[PDB]
Structure formats: C-alpha cells, structure tokens
Subunit: 58 residues, 4 copies
C-alpha cells in the first residue's frame, strides 16, 4: 500500500529542495498519496508533497 | 486518542483563516498532534496545523 | 517588468486552487518572478506561487 | 521603514526553525510586514513569516 512509512528519510526529487523524515500523510483527490516531511535542517518545519515528488534515501 | 478524524469539517480558531476537511495527520516534537486540512473554498490546497489551532464545525 | 501589481485579483491556473489578491512578491533562482496571494475566502492566509502558475481575473 | 532587505540572512526566532536569505516581502492586515525567506539548506524552498518571527544573523 503506502510507499513510505513514518521515519523514512526522504528528499524532493526535483525543483525546490527538501529533505528529512516522514512525519505524516494526507490524501486528496489531487494528491491521493501525500506525505508530510519534517526538515532535518530546520527542526519543526514541515512541508507536504505528493509521493511522486519524493524519493527515499539512506 | 485523535481529536479529529478524516473528513471532519474544521476551521482555524484564530489568526489566519482556513476551513475545510481533515485529509491527513502529522506528528513532530513541536506538533505532536497535527492535521492536514483541505480548503473547502480552494479544492486541492492543503495546509497543516496543530490540533490546538483547529476546531470542528458542523 | 512585473506581470502583476499589489491588489490584483488572481487565481491559480491549474492544480491546487487559490484565489485572492496579490499582497507581495519574491524572487529566487527557481522562481525569478513569484507572488504572494492572500486568499479572498480565508483572510490572512497567504500562499506563494510562480507567475506562470497565476492568472489575473476581474 | 523595512526591517530587512533583500539578501539579508535571517532565522526564525522560535518554534519551527528556518534560516536563509530574504527573497521577498508581503503585507496583509494580519501581517503588515512579512518576509519571504529562501532556505539556505533547501535551495528553492521558500517560507513566509511576519517580521516579529525573524531575526537577522551574520
């Protein structure tokens, strides 16, 4: 089912950079599999992205 | 356990406004219970907030 | 020079929806002409987008 | 007038962390003096904050 799990280390594949740990998930019609990622550089800051935008590292 | 569930209609209590449906969740040390909310006015747009920032309506 | 000015009413062209007034601007190498847009539905909430993502309405 | 200028290195004072360069500005009734900050750790990623949330470093 889910591509990533809580605590996986991921980064953005392209475009704006982001890297850190999976800390949650979301699901919309536009993004049926999305993840919340907490920056490893900026503790407490979280961004949300579609699964296609992310890759696991490690 | 969780204050809200998927599909609950919520709004921001104060400050910047946001209103729509719960579409996910996240957990960080700064925000141990956070929610993703898809705007009911702006389909596909999602913002994330701590539970203390949100209230259920309906 | 700038495509939009302060107070222009704009919306996202595609994808996640957003609509409201231009309230600022930003410039990065990835987004050399970006705008801050305050939602007309959700006062106080602001999102930032590249100019190519937005169109003026109205 | 403005507290910061383009290219100033700033960080969040408290709460969620963010650090990098001023790349824009915004103005709303809730945030009459706001700044866009591009992360120095995550090139291309930009977050917006009220001036009270930021301090100049460096």
């Amino acid at each position: 089912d889910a591509t990533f799990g809580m605590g996986d280390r991921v980064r953005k594949k392209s475009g704006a950079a982001w890297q850190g740990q999976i800390v949650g998930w979301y699901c919309t019609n536009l993004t049926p599999e999305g993840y919340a990622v907490e920056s490893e550089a900026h503790p407490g800051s979280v961004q949300i992205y579609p699964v296609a935008a992310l890759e696991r590292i490690n």
